[PDB]
Design an enzyme around this catalytic site. Structure first.
Site, PDB file in Angstrom:
ATOM      1  N   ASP A   1       0.823  -1.227   0.000  1.00  0.00           N
ATOM      2  CA  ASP A   1       0.000   0.000   0.000  1.00  0.00           C
ATOM      3  C   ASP A   1       0.850   1.267   0.000  1.00  0.00           C
ATOM      4  O   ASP A   1       0.571   2.208   0.748  1.00  0.00           O
ATOM      5  CB  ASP A   1      -0.951   0.001   1.217  1.00  0.00           C
ATOM      6  CG  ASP A   1      -2.107   1.022   1.100  1.00  0.00           C
ATOM      7  OD1 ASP A   1      -2.344   1.588   0.008  1.00  0.00           O
ATOM      8  OD2 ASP A   1      -2.787   1.273   2.122  1.00  0.00           O
TER       9      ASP A   1
ATOM     10  N   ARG B   1      -0.036   9.066   1.270  1.00  0.00           N
ATOM     11  CA  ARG B   1      -0.805   9.008   2.510  1.00  0.00           C
ATOM     12  C   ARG B   1      -0.174   8.074   3.554  1.00  0.00           C
ATOM     13  O   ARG B   1      -0.491   8.181   4.738  1.00  0.00           O
ATOM     14  CB  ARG B   1      -2.254   8.568   2.243  1.00  0.00           C
ATOM     15  CG  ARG B   1      -2.372   7.165   1.656  1.00  0.00           C
ATOM     16  CD  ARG B   1      -3.826   6.726   1.417  1.00  0.00           C
ATOM     17  NE  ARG B   1      -3.797   5.416   0.768  1.00  0.00           N
ATOM     18  CZ  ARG B   1      -3.666   5.252  -0.540  1.00  0.00           C
ATOM     19  NH1 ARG B   1      -3.631   6.320  -1.336  1.00  0.00           N
ATOM     20  NH2 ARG B   1      -3.583   4.042  -1.064  1.00  0.00           N
ATOM     21  N   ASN B   2       0.713   7.173   3.127  1.00  0.00           N
ATOM     22  CA  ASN B   2       1.359   6.265   4.078  1.00  0.00           C
ATOM     23  C   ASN B   2       2.801   6.659   4.370  1.00  0.00           C
ATOM     24  O   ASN B   2       3.539   5.916   5.010  1.00  0.00           O
ATOM     25  CB  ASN B   2       1.292   4.810   3.582  1.00  0.00           C
ATOM     26  CG  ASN B   2      -0.068   4.179   3.864  1.00  0.00           C
ATOM     27  OD1 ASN B   2      -0.705   4.492   4.878  1.00  0.00           O
ATOM     28  ND2 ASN B   2      -0.544   3.335   2.954  1.00  0.00           N
TER      29      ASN B   2
ATOM     30  N   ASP C   1       2.572   2.672   7.397  1.00  0.00           N
ATOM     31  CA  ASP C   1       1.361   2.080   6.830  1.00  0.00           C
ATOM     32  C   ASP C   1       0.209   2.243   7.821  1.00  0.00           C
ATOM     33  O   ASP C   1       0.198   1.597   8.871  1.00  0.00           O
ATOM     34  CB  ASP C   1       1.590   0.604   6.492  1.00  0.00           C
ATOM     35  CG  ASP C   1       0.419  -0.030   5.754  1.00  0.00           C
ATOM     36  OD1 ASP C   1      -0.625   0.633   5.567  1.00  0.00           O
ATOM     37  OD2 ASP C   1       0.543  -1.215   5.377  1.00  0.00           O
TER      38      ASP C   1
HETATM   39  O1  LIG Z   1       2.977   2.540  10.263  1.00  0.00           O
HETATM   40  C1  LIG Z   1       2.834   1.901  11.299  1.00  0.00           C
HETATM   41  N1  LIG Z   1       2.663   0.546  11.261  1.00  0.00           N
HETATM   42  C2  LIG Z   1       2.739  -0.177  10.003  1.00  0.00           C
HETATM   43  C3  LIG Z   1       1.597  -1.219   9.904  1.00  0.00           C
HETATM   44  N2  LIG Z   1       2.152  -2.586  10.062  1.00  0.00           N
HETATM   45  C4  LIG Z   1       3.619  -2.498  10.193  1.00  0.00           C
HETATM   46  C5  LIG Z   1       4.052  -0.999   9.999  1.00  0.00           C
HETATM   47  C6  LIG Z   1       4.821  -0.724   8.740  1.00  0.00           C
HETATM   48  C7  LIG Z   1       5.817   0.243   8.766  1.00  0.00           C
HETATM   49  C8  LIG Z   1       6.500   0.588   7.617  1.00  0.00           C
HETATM   50  C9  LIG Z   1       6.198  -0.026   6.415  1.00  0.00           C
HETATM   51  C10 LIG Z   1       5.206  -1.008   6.369  1.00  0.00           C
HETATM   52  C11 LIG Z   1       4.514  -1.363   7.538  1.00  0.00           C
HETATM   53  C12 LIG Z   1       2.781   2.559  12.614  1.00  0.00           C
HETATM   54  C13 LIG Z   1       2.581   1.871  13.807  1.00  0.00           C
HETATM   55  C14 LIG Z   1       2.574   2.559  15.013  1.00  0.00           C
HETATM   56  C15 LIG Z   1       2.796   3.928  14.998  1.00  0.00           C
HETATM   57 CL1  LIG Z   1       2.692   4.763  16.520  1.00  0.00          CL
HETATM   58  C16 LIG Z   1       3.046   4.608  13.820  1.00  0.00           C
HETATM   59  C17 LIG Z   1       3.555   6.031  13.867  1.00  0.00           C
HETATM   60  O2  LIG Z   1       2.499   6.880  13.788  1.00  0.00           O
HETATM   61  C18 LIG Z   1       2.784   8.233  13.636  1.00  0.00           C
HETATM   62  C19 LIG Z   1       4.060   8.859  13.837  1.00  0.00           C
HETATM   63  N3  LIG Z   1       4.272  10.188  13.710  1.00  0.00           N
HETATM   64  C20 LIG Z   1       3.143  10.875  13.358  1.00  0.00           C
HETATM   65  N4  LIG Z   1       3.035  12.251  13.135  1.00  0.00           N
HETATM   66  C21 LIG Z   1       1.715  12.533  12.791  1.00  0.00           C
HETATM   67  C22 LIG Z   1       0.958  11.383  12.785  1.00  0.00           C
HETATM   68  C23 LIG Z   1       1.837  10.315  13.139  1.00  0.00           C
HETATM   69  C24 LIG Z   1       1.674   8.941  13.286  1.00  0.00           C
HETATM   70  C25 LIG Z   1       2.987   3.924  12.627  1.00  0.00           C
END
Ligand SMILES: O=C(N[C@@H]1CNC[C@H]1c1ccccc1)c1ccc(Cl)c(COc2cnc3[nH]ccc3c2)c1
Length: 284
Positions: A137, A141-142, A155
């Site tokens: 995906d 947006r990701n 993601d």
């Molecule tokens: O993307 C995550 N998880 C994906 C889904 N499954 C594995 C992983 C993945 C990573 C990479 C590639 C593929 C999958 C994920 C999980 C937890 C947290 Cl807290 C965050 C950070 O959120 C943030 C950080 N700063 C922000 N600023 C403003 C908004 C905001 C949000 C993101």
């Protein structure tokens, strides 16, 4: 591990299928800001399982352009997942708030900075490819934006109201980001590094459009899916995203290669990165 009581919750950054994300302060890191995912208040047994698996998946990811797991809450605490806080948020929202700098004369962004944004994404995807990890995906947006136009790939799933129009939903089926998907993904529902390259081409298109327009935005979902059929039949009726105003023809030809019918003819992320980081600089 980390104690939940040591976190100070400041604001809600988002909400997903099996968790929600909050901006937190930490005063004893061993005023630091972090992003913390916790269970939703209606957390089911199923959600908890998905949460534990997400921790395992994120434990794998160690690269400057991929979001990283800083820690998890202690065994006895309610579940949490801690990562860096990307202070400029969503790349789609970020770029939306800029326009291309006018060379002749409102935050703006230069063409070389758009290349730098896209190159960082390519570097993150190059890393994921070395893990044989398929994103499935990739889209602006990701992606997340930090200080000084630093980009990390993440993601956030397919349920956010804000991006609902970016997904094709049929009862009982997987949700599909069809406008970002390679023809073979649409027809046969399976994802590879080569289809991640296709999605990268669309993501690169988004970046050069400064996120001003949905891919194939004047075509229906049904027409986007039918376009996948025209790739399959290979009779020259398939259509492509058009060249963005900010995009030189040489860079557009790179994007078109990402949308090659044959998976093997799509450029690897190593080639994409080199082009964006170096070759493209003579198109400035
Ligand atoms: O993307 C995550 N998880 C994906 C889904 N499954 C594995 C992983 C993945 C990573 C990479 C590639 C593929 C999958 C994920 C999980 C937890 C947290 Cl807290 C965050 C950070 O959120 C943030 C950080 N700063 C922000 N600023 C403003 C908004 C905001 C949000 C993101």
């Amino acid at each position: 591990d980390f104690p939940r009581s040591r976190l100070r919750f400041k604001e809600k950054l988002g909400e997903g299928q099996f968790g929600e994300v909050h901006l937190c302060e930490v005063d004893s890191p061993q005023p630091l800001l972090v992003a913390v995912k916790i269970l939703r208040p209606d957390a089911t047994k199923n959600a908890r399982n998905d949460f534990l698996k997400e921790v395992k998946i994120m434990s794998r990811l160690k690269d400057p352009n991929i979001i990283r797991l800083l820690g998890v809450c202690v065994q006895d605490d309610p579940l949490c997942m801690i990562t860096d806080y990307m202070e400029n948020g969503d790349l789609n929202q970020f770029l939306s708030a800029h326009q291309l700098e006018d060379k002749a004369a409102d935050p703006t962004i230069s063409y070389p900075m758009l290349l730098h944004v896209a190159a960082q994404i390519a570097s993150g995807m190059r890393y994921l490819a070395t893990l044989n990890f398929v994103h499935r995906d990739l889209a602006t947006r990701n992606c997340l934006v930090g200080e000084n136009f630093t980009i990390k790939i993440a993601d956030f799933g397919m349920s956010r109201n804000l991006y609902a129009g970016d997904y094709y939903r049929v009862q009982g089926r997987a949700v599909l980001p069809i406008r970002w998907m390679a023809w073979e993904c649409i027809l046969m529902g399976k994802f590879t590094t080569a289809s991640d390259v296709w999605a990268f081409g669309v993501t690169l298109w988004e970046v050069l459009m400064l996120c001003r327009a949905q891919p194939f935005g004047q075509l229906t979902d049904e027409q986007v899916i039918e376009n996948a059929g025209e790739f399959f039949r290979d009779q020259g009726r398939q259509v492509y995203l058009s060249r963005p105003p900010a995009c030189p023809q040489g860079l557009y030809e790179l994007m078109l290669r990402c949308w090659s019918r044959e998976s093997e003819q799509r450029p690897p992320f190593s080639q994409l990165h080199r082009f964006l980081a170096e070759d493209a600089l003579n198109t400035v």
